[PDB]
Amino acid sequence: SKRRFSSEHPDPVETSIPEQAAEIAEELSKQHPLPSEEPLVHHDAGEFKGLQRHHTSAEEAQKLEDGKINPFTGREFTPKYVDILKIRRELPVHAQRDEFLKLYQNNQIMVFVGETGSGKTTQIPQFVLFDEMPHLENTQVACTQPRRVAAMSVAQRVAEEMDVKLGEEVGYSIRFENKTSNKTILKYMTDGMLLREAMEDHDLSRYSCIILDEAHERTLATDILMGLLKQVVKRRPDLKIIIMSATLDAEKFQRYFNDAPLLAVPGRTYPVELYYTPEFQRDYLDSAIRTVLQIHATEEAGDILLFLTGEDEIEDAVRKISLEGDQLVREEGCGPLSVYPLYGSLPPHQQQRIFEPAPESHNGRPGRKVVISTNIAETSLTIDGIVYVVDPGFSKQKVYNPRIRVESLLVSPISKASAQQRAGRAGRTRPGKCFRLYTEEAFQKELIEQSYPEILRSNLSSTVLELKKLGIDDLVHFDFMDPPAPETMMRALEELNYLACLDDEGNLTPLGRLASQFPLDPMLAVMLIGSFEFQCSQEILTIVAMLSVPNVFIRPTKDKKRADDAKNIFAHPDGDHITLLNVYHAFKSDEAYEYGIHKWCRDHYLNYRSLSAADNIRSQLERLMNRYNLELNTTDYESPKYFDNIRKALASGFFMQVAKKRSGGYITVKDNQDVLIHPSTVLGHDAEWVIYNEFVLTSKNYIRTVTSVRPEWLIEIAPAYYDLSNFQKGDVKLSLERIKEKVDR
Numbered sequence: 001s002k003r004r005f006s007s008e009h010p011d012p013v014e015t016s017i018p019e020q021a022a023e024i025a026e027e028l029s030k031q032h033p034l035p036s037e038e039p040l041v042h043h044d045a046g047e048f049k050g051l052q053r054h055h056t057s058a059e060e061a062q063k064l065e066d067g068k069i070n071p072f073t074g075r076e077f078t079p080k081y082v083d084i085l086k087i088r089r090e091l092p093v094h095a096q097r098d099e100f101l102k103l104y105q106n107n108q109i110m111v112f113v114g115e116t117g118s119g120k121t122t123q124i125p126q127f128v129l130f131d132e133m134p135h136l137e138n139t140q141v142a143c144t145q146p147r148r149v150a151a152m153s154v155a156q157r158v159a160e161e162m163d164v165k166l167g168e169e170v171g172y173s174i175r176f177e178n179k180t181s182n183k184t185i186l187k188y189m190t191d192g193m194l195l196r197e198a199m200e201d202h203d204l205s206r207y208s209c210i211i212l213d214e215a216h217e218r219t220l221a222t223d224i225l226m227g228l229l230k231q232v233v234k235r236r237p238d239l240k241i242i243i244m245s246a247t248l249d250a251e252k253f254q255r256y257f258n259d260a261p262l263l264a265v266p267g268r269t270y271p272v273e274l275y276y277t278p279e280f281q282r283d284y285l286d287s288a289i290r291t292v293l294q295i296h297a298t299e300e301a302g303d304i305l306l307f308l309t310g311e312d313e314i315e316d317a318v319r320k321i322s323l324e325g326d327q328l329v330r331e332e333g334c335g336p337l338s339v340y341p342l343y344g345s346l347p348p349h350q351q352q353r354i355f356e357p358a359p360e361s362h363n364g365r366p367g368r369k370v371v372i373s374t375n376i377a378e379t380s381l382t383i384d385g386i387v388y389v390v391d392p393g394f395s396k397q398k399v400y401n402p403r404i405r406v407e408s409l410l411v412s413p414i415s416k417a418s419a420q421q422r423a424g425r426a427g428r429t430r431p432g433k434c435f436r437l438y439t440e441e442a443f444q445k446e447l448i449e450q451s452y453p454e455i456l457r458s459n460l461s462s463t464v465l466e467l468k469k470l471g472i473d474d475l476v477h478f479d480f481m482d483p484p485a486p487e488t489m490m491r492a493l494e495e496l497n498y499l500a501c502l503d504d505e506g507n508l509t510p511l512g513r514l515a516s517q518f519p520l521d522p523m524l525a526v527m528l529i530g531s532f533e534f535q536c537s538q539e540i541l542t543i544v545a546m547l548s549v550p551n552v553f554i555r556p557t558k559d560k561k562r563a564d565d566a567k568n569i570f571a572h573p574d575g576d577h578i579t580l581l582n583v584y585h586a587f588k589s590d591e592a593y594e595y596g597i598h599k600w601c602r603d604h605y606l607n608y609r610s611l612s613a614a615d616n617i618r619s620q621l622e623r624l625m626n627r628y629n630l631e632l633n634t635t636d637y638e639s640p641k642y643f644d645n646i647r648k649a650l651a652s653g654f655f656m657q658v659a660k661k662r663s664g665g666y667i668t669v670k671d672n673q674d675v676l677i678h679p680s681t682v683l684g685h686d687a688e689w690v691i692y693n694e695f696v697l698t699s700k701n702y703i704r705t706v707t708s709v710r711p712e713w714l715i716e717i718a719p720a721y722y723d724l725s726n727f728q729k730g731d732v733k734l735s736l737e738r739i740k741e742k743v744d745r
């Protein structure tokens, strides 16, 4: 039966300030409706005249590839293209081009499996372009990657293989980073971005072929896309789907996709000798560094791939290995050693450096390259010339606590399957070696066989909103390859209703619709959207952008006091979220610019990479706010309301991540969890109630990035949530009872 609302138990949608803001924006949007998307353009001067769609062969395409003129653009092929062409033609998938074409031509969905390095991501979509000729039928081909870095780097490489400009006929799309145009035929993109395109066009009508790549990684976005496309093909006989995977055991995929056929590429990996440590290695970074330097000093020529876990750790390793490499050249006459980082947030000009040839030695001992990478390099891309892998056995992995309902990103041991994939990267060129920084027994007995798919390790708040925007009513029966626990889904539905993104019958509100237009977690989107109602949308836009990048404050272990003093320049007491606004504002100041911005960040213990990323995100979010008619406004800094307005806007999104100082640590409003303020913040005595950005789970529970709030504001802004009937007996409830009493008198 329809839920009943009253003053005692009010309607979360009728009492949401962001919902008011979205209703205003929506009416403004109706006054001037958005034009439809720019149409595709293409080139056609008869070059494909001799080819028939879905009846082409490898020979016909080779004739076109060998021709004088690039058939996709009408410009003469360069000499560089021709040299690239000869080399990629030795890739293993080329030997099965006709077998692949036949499967593609005769089936709507197919599964394609092959080892990393075999040429799946770069070659197959080019094979499809010849047979499908998508640009001659007003369409594109999409190829999704779980990893940003893979999509960006392969798109750059495939633009060169196809002899076209990046962003034109070959382009990429990542959240906040678009490199496509009306000319784009082949779009590499993260799986999350094709999911966002589907939210706007449920049938994905722009694509005639969609290739879901690296499916063995089983990311959440990839799982949703699989479930969606298994329905879209029923409506779209003109859509073909290719599922590509590294894991040569793809039985489960074929079954899930209606017994689709499988094309398997036989492996061509050279033998790799495995080395283990005799004992447990307690401190793996220094063991890794020693191992890389030993290899460099004693092994024959061949590059090194070191797997680490995250960007600060990799930059620290790059610095130490570079220094120690240089010491070896000068002290022992080792060959030159170049050292490159690879991790998720790296800028594309820096991604490309990993493919540079090793330096030439002028002294008789081998010059060598070390790439220090996350598990991006486990299966998603290949650096030619690797012969040695160092595997500390760890990666950063999302874990989920069902009761607490909290996702945590933690460094933990990898699976045996991941360890096998890491070792395999040493055998792409010739017999290689893999140095595992753990015992053969830890590998045989202690590592789990296989990591669980991401959907079983996620809060599903974004996922539920996406599925709703996609027009899925019955979330429980959505056809996931591995369904999540139904309770996780139900908790997500309830949160979204409290945020007023869904009403109580599970339908999208104007706020839910508008929130779905922002590539942000729902709490952030709702905070942003509502913020012009609190007269601080300029400031909240900054804050949301800063919450979308990592912690910008550098704190070296042996330089804490100077790093802490620098942060205090920007820190707002009882207001970590305002600290974020202060640092971004200083970063964008004329003064920092005149100081020289790179130097300015270093001297102030700030990460330029992170700030620069926030600045781009802020520009892209601003463009969405303009597109969807969310006013950019602000309040005089000297207004007595200036900081109140910011705290209120924050509360409008984050009212469910609130903690109260214990009467007799803090206690969370949601689930009554005992927590400590994370040591990165010390609050004053006036911070009885705070909003936190993050719940941190180590041996104890902390909340991190905390700003104080008046509890009266919480009741005012989120009365359906702060309904005392909702609360268990205890400290929080008591304190809230007293606050309500007093708000009346």
Ligand SMILES: Nc1ncnc2c1ncn2[C@@H]1O[C@H](COP(=O)(O)OP(=O)(O)O)[C@@H](O)[C@H]1O
Pocket: 091, 114, 115, 116, 117, 118, 119, 120, 121, 122, 123, 153, 154, 157, 355, 379, 380, 381, 382, 383, 384
């Ligand atoms: N970014 C790149 N720059 C230069 N060469 C590359 C690049 N990426 C891949 N290659 C080469 O192309 C081959 C095919 O790579 P790719 O299509 O990524 O294979 P897969 O997707 O099957 O793991 C690799 O063996 C490597 O030789």
Ligand SMILES: [Mg+2]
Pocket: 120, 121, 122, 213, 379, 380, 381
């Ligand atoms: Mg690939």
Ligand code: NI
Pocket: 477
């Ligand atoms: Ni059922």
